[PDB]
Amino acid sequence: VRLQRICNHPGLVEPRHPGSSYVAGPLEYPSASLILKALERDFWKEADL
Amino acid sequence: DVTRIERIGAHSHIRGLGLDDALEPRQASQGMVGQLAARRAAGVVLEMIREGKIAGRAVLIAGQPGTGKTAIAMGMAQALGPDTPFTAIAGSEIFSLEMSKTEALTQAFRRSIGVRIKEETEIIEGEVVEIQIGKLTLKTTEMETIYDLGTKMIESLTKDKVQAGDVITIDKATGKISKLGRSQCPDGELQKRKEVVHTVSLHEIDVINSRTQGFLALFSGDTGEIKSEVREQINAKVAEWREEGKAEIIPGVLFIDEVHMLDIESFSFLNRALESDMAPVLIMATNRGITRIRGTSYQSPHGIPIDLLDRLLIVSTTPYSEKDTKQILRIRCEEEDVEMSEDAYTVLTRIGLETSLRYAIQLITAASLVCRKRKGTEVQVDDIKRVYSLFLDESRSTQYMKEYQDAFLFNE
């Protein structure tokens, strides 16, 4: 029966799977809140440049 | 737990400097052997780093090839706490096609100084009981509570489908909800206050604030010549954080292995870079004697100009004796799980003294493989002789290249 399967069509025993990429999760990168507050100057120290 | 990413390298056996509380170096401790004076000096430098009060201190490790300079540096990295940054680069790595040499050295310096920021946040973690849209009911194994939902929190719970029976955690200040499964239910308090401590290098701050989504440049590279104004503004903001107490500065180490590959421009930059108050402790290694400085015709005691050599303290590494070489071979064998007979140890020590230490270290693995092939259990002299026959050292290879000089290309 197995040989008859193969004689009919190889996809009966070993089908061609669709090749696909691996997908990784994003590299989560922790940082402090202050890091984003850098370069933020008080509005009482910024002139109308 | 098989075939981890970290495998047995050249400096895997080194776990520290092997020093006492008086910085007296033990003859064999934490993988280190001999180099007593240089290990004591490395320990003094390590204490300097840990104190972190003085900025811009430079130390050069100098000696013959194989005298354990990179080993000393790796030991200092291992002994130094993982919290404190330790940037280790080769001297050829500053020749980037994406940034100038001075910019690469600047980034390396700023990668070696860390800003430690502590902040508290409130985290809610529990099991969902009932959700009405708004009202939210959460329970733990010890307590249950019902919360009145806001418009933004209702939107957050609507975007991420949350239903009864799910176990989720919510950041109270931001509403960040992540589902971790369905129901073990959390045991303790539903609402907890957690301090979190991040150490962010000055370079990470610079790049994060360089541009929109600038943190991507911390991973892929792509960081151009960061503007000097941004760096100055960040230096001032970091000083303000230190004054206000919002952050602490953790000075680290920049290690430039084989610094002799730097050019006169890089050395001139290093002359002034070590004079800033945010300069880290610089450690260098070089085997060059009096030799020409790259980019100039001038010869210098280490390929480093005497301007920079005047800004640094030099640590010399001696040759090893027979006992130290044998002990290093023993520690490498223990690291690689190789059992050798005493006569094999003597033969390998003789080979290491005669030809090279690295050659003996490589012959350790070669002899182990040859012994495994013959169904052996302990490496014998026959295996050391076999691997000595199969594999040549630089001296013997050179002698054979001289024997057949007519067959080689551009031989002189």
Added chain:
Amino acid sequence: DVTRIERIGAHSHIRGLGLDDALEPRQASQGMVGQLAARRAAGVVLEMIREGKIAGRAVLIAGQPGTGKTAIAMGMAQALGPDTPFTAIAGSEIFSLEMSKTEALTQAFRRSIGVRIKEETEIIEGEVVEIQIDRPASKVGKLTLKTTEMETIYDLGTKMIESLTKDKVQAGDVITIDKATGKISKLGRSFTRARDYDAMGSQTKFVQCPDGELQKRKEVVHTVSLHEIDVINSRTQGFLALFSGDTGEIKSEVREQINAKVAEWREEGKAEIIPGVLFIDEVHMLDIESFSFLNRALESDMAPVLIMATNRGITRIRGTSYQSPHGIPIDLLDRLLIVSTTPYSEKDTKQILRIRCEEEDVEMSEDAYTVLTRIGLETSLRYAIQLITAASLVCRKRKGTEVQVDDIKRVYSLFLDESRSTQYMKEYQDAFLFN
């Protein structure tokens, strides 16, 4: 008659290698004169190329300047035909600001390997005899096609209706429909539009009615080089870089993926490899890094047949201080066969001048042929060739029919060769810069 893009060039007389069935060169065939040993070797190399079984075979054509190395290369190209790719580059072309020298050599190698794809398509081909499209203001439609053998009425889907409307299919159009994708192509019209319609100012010729069945199983052959595949797969908008040349260093992983799938396509029936020729003229302009890459590159199974030419003797390899034969390292010279070209004689030079006169369409007297052959032997072959054209122009200026000796003497006096110009430069050396 009309001035085409291609004009009479320096090798326009070369039509091939001029060999018989036994690869024994003829004295004067297909524009080739002399070089019997070199042409026989070129024929053997061309057979080796056409067999395609051996990869990375390198042949260097070495000889004195003006002995026919580029001529032999062009003859090989002509006898190879357009089916087999033949990429000819100057050695100085690899020095690029867009990519490394090794990337340039890879793209040159991959450009010299064709991939001949085959696919079967369902093609409808017939004369539109009636088309009806009804739309609200979904669309419905009915199309009838004829092919002398049959006339079939089709009920049209929405997508086919949209395609037919976009193509503006009208009755009397001989169209082709690709059932695999619905692309509609018009071969031509079969008869005029109604004469009663104003504008429509055309009376184009009408193609003959199709024959046989309306729908046929047609096999189509598409050939692309490996470089085209690489550039297409390098990025989302890769195909635009095939023309602009804005190709950065294509990732080696993509090239390995392509090599693997091409191997599968040749294990399957989908594609056939056509390995061709990369001709690096003046290869001595390559530096040591390029030769060192060529050493490993020829060991690849996808490497083409590399042909090289250079006139340098034992000279300094570029980028180094070492002298080697041909300006090529001994490590690459070991990996190649050298073919040597010999200087021509009086008879060969005269035959070459005759062929050049024939291609330039210059009638010239036998005494003029003798004096020009003497000049060419004395000075150079190319100088005599250029005097052919100059003397033709001078003869036509005087309303003469045949270039005589007076014209050759005139153009010889007008235009100098390297030697007489050098002598006059030395006679006035103080006037030239930096002595």
Added chain:
Amino acid sequence: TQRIASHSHVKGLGLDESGLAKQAASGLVGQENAREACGVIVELIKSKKMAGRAVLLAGPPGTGKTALALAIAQELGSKVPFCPMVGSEVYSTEIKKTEVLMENFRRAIGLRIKETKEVYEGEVTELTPHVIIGLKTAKGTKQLKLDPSIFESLQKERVEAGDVIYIEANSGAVKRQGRCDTYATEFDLEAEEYVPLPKGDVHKKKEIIQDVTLHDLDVANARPQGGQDILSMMGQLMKPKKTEITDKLRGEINKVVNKYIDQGIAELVPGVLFVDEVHMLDIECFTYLHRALESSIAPIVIFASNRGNCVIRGTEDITSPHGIPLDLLDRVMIIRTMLYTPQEMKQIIKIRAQTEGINISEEALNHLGEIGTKTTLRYSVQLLTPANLLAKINGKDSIEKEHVEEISELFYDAKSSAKILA
């Protein structure tokens, strides 16, 4: 038949069970000592214990260095990564030399990750605007709620009800592959391609094993192509270019891979980096290789060199035994390849003839061997296919001595050409 390359005959090292080289086995001839040393090196690579161990194949040209390296690659198999490279390839115009070296080091470390792929497939029934779409298969019909990103992907595919779609929820990729064969008879002619209904379940989970290098993860995270968001999409428009990947990114990838190995959903397969023309590197590359080879992550690296005592590229007057500075020669094991005797040359020529499908007589073989005693082995081999072409043209099915002589008269060797020039 596949095209025959210079190293096609090499099928392995031809070592016996006791690791000793047979005189002629697996395409290789002679070089017994060097084959045995490459045997011990293959065993080292298979042991997966040592990182960063380097070996240098040093010998005259044509003495088998590249053949030995490819024999090692064959003995390892297709499972073990093998990255052949040339030293001249490090001179990239896009990234620095050290980045090219590091990327090649990371390419040679493989990783087999078993990943669970969940696929939704079927014929679309409803596309109600989050979207509650429906899929129908040979088994039954299910209603599914998907992220708006999947809906935008469907719109990109222009999916309409009645079309057969393939949705990989892991990567958020949708492939519309046709309209259902049920509709294939509705119109006598339509522009679309019809495909049968899927026979399996609507939602299927399949476990697959993916082979990637660490370099693949590095480049994927450095230049992300999976953001499917406005800023990432705008970034994807930018011209692609190699970038100087930082050590932070490689450390993060190291941590992720360690977590995968701990979970058991991944296996790490250290492979080989082979640098053919190491003397083409400069002193900067060698200085970087010092640190690189000492790393606990580095693969087994194989070097080839045919230079004598020559000048190191990038220095002024520093000469070294193979063009490699003495500091790097101390870190490598050296394997010496010896010149071939005429009998070994005759055996190699016979093997090359048998690989190329060429029949050669004993007298012709002896003449070709004599030609190889002068000139070089490569030249004597390279005369086989021209001579077989001339044999076929002359109506003979075997190379005779006359054809060898004629080909040697048509084609000159390097020494003969040098003599002519001199």
Added chain:
Amino acid sequence: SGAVKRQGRCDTYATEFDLEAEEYVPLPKGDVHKKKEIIQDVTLHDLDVANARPQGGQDILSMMG
């Protein structure tokens, strides 16, 4: 300049809900209208780089920039 910045919700409404993802900021202490004479030091290079490339533009080309 007429620029308006919403610096959070007033802390008097911190009890309007038990769980909202909002930033509460205290009510300002001084008067509604505040005057302050200020000084800022800039370099000419700062003006050069500010005018080197448009910033803050809502146009798509400015957003890409």
Added chain:
Amino acid sequence: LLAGPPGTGKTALALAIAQELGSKVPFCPMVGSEVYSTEIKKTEVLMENFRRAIGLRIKETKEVY
């Protein structure tokens, strides 16, 4: 031009000048090797550093409601 043997206080003297001037007066330090930018020509780096050393104190009354 501050001239003399290494370690004779040339940089110390320049920093003493900077201290005597004060924070308001700009003081741009640079090293000769910093002109070799890979993005802009050396003369551009020098012009940028020239412009950095010129300050401009801008005085304004902010009015905010």
